[PDB]
Amino acid sequence: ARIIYDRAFLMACRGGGGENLYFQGKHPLQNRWALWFFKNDKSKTWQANLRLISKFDTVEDFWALYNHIQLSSNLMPGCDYSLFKDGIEPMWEDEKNKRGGRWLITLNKQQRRSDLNRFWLETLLCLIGESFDDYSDDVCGAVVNVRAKGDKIAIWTTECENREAVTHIGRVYKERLGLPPKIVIGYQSHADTATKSGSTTKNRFVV
Amino acid sequence: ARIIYDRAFLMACRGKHPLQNRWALWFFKNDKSKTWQANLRLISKFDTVEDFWALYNHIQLSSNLMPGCDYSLFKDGIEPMWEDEKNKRGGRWLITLNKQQRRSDLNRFWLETLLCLIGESFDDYSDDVCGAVVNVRAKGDKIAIWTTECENREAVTHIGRVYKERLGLPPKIVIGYQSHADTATKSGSTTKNRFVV
Ligand SMILES: CC[C@H](O[C@H](C)CO)c1ccc(-c2ccccc2F)cc1NCCO
Ligand SMILES: CC[C@H](O[C@H](C)CO)c1ccc(-c2ccccc2F)cc1NCCO
Numbered sequence: 150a151r152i153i154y155d156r157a158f159l160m161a162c163r164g165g166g167g168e169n170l171y172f173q174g175k176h177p178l179q180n181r182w183a184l185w186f187f188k189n190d191k192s193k194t195w196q197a198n199l200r201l202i203s204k205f206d207t208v209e210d211f212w213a214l215y216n217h218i219q220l221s222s223n224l225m226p227g228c229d230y231s232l233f234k235d236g237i238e239p240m241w242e243d244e245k246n247k248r249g250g251r252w253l254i255t256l257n258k259q260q261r262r263s264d265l266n267r268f269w270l271e272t273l274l275c276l277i278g279e280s281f282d283d284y285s286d287d288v289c290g291a292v293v294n295v296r297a298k299g300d301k302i303a304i305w306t307t308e309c310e311n312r313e314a315v316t317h318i319g320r321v322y323k324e325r326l327g328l329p330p331k332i333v334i335g336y337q338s339h340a341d342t343a344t345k346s347g348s349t350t351k352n353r354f355v356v
Numbered sequence: 357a358r359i360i361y362d363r364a365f366l367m368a369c370r371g372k373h374p375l376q377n378r379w380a381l382w383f384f385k386n387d388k389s390k391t392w393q394a395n396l397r398l399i400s401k402f403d404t405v406e407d408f409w410a411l412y413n414h415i416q417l418s419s420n421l422m423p424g425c426d427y428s429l430f431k432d433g434i435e436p437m438w439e440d441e442k443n444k445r446g447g448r449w450l451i452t453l454n455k456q457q458r459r460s461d462l463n464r465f466w467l468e469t470l471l472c473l474i475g476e477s478f479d480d481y482s483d484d485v486c487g488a489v490v491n492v493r494a495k496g497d498k499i500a501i502w503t504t505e506c507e508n509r510e511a512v513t514h515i516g517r518v519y520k521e522r523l524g525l526p527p528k529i530v531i532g533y534q535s536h537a538d539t540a541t542k543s544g545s546t547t548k549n550r551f552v553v
Contacts, residue, residue, distance in 0.1 A: 204374075
């Protein structure tokens with residue numbers, strides 16, 4: 150049976166406390182997850198800029214990692230963070246992303262201060278909590294691109310032709326973000342996003 | 357929980373199973389026309405048993421063995437240079453192959469070394485492993501496991517003992533652990549060993 154945590158449960162497991170007696174007191178995740186960082190440098194190759202930070206598979210180890218990064222880390226533009234299921238690289242060329250795409254939220258300059266941290270955490274909860282019912286199996290991961298022009302947050306899914314999975318992910322995600330129903334989010338095939346065709350990329354789906 | 361694969365398991369996964377660590381394969385060469393950083397090339401990274409074997413099977417089919425060249429597999433975020441923050445206080449267990457041992461032992465010992473790394477073969481003391489280097493040379497090839505701290509005797513000697521076991525070296529063939537700080541100093545014909553097994 151799928152391990153599913155709602156938003157309230159994940160939030161109550163936060164701040165630590167549990168003794169983890171018998172190694173049996175932590176709350177297991179459905180999936181193991183890997184946190185990645187990708188910098189920009191004096192042309193290091195794409196592989197040399199992509200770094201694995203940490204992996205986890207309990208609610209408590211998620212929060213120790215989240216609380217740590219929140220206390221310790223700086224927010225540099227040009228950088229990207231990704232949380233992906235164990236064994237999927239955060240690159241669209243990966244077997245599990247090549248046929249896929251992303252549900253994209255773009256924030257303007259002003260919304261860095263107000264919405265970036267909030268929307269990123271809400272995104273992470275959706276992933277580790279298995280919030281999309283059977284369609285959570287279609288999730289690969291989520292990416293945050295920290296940029297001067299405006300930040301991007303996206304959930305990556307495995308198959309852009311699975312309309313029922315994709316649209317359900319998008320509905321629940323927009324709901325969990327608490328976006329106004331007139332803020333429309335768009336799902337972009339990685340194959341279209343890889344092609345630079347001018348102004349904007351095509352949306353396969355919108356919610 | 358720690359991800360440990362014995363030698364039989366890794367061999368049966370060959371032609372996904374996650375590795376404890378992500379690993380980076382590097383290529384380097386002693387050309388003078390170019391600065392050291394121009395000679396250090398990053399080939400690929402991986403973090404599953406299957407992606408290790410796709411990379412190993414590829415390099416085994418495709419690549420040529422040129423002397424003067426070095427290959428290195430290091431944990432993600434450690435450069436294969438003794439000046440790195442994770443190698444500067446460290447050293448290496450060293451296996452020198454003589455000229456005839458190239459044809460017979462280089463490929464075998466290099467693979468057995470790689471299995472020790474990706475499989476986490478040293479129990480808690482695999483956290484002390486930084487990587488492994490192969491120096492392909494005319495005089496005789498060198499294979500070494502690099503560890504992070506030459507003063508961690510219990511970690512170092514356990515690595516050395518399990519490594520010599522996994523290489524199937526006879527107990528008469530003694531391997532030596534050399535601090536990077538001594539190996540950086542040229543003091544004559546060989547370097548001092550901090551430990552021996
Ligand atoms: C520098 C902090 C960075 O900020 C983002 C861009 C906005 O929030 C960031 C990156 C990764 C994670 C992270 C942590 C645990 C699991 C998975 C993760 F992606 C958390 C944070 N920061 C949260 C608090 O600001
Ligand atoms: C010439 C190929 C070279 O040969 C060594 C020196 C002796 O063996 C070499 C280098 C790297 C790797 C390698 C591949 C995947 C992950 C990590 C690695 F270090 C494999 C090989 N050779 C395999 C076949 O012998």
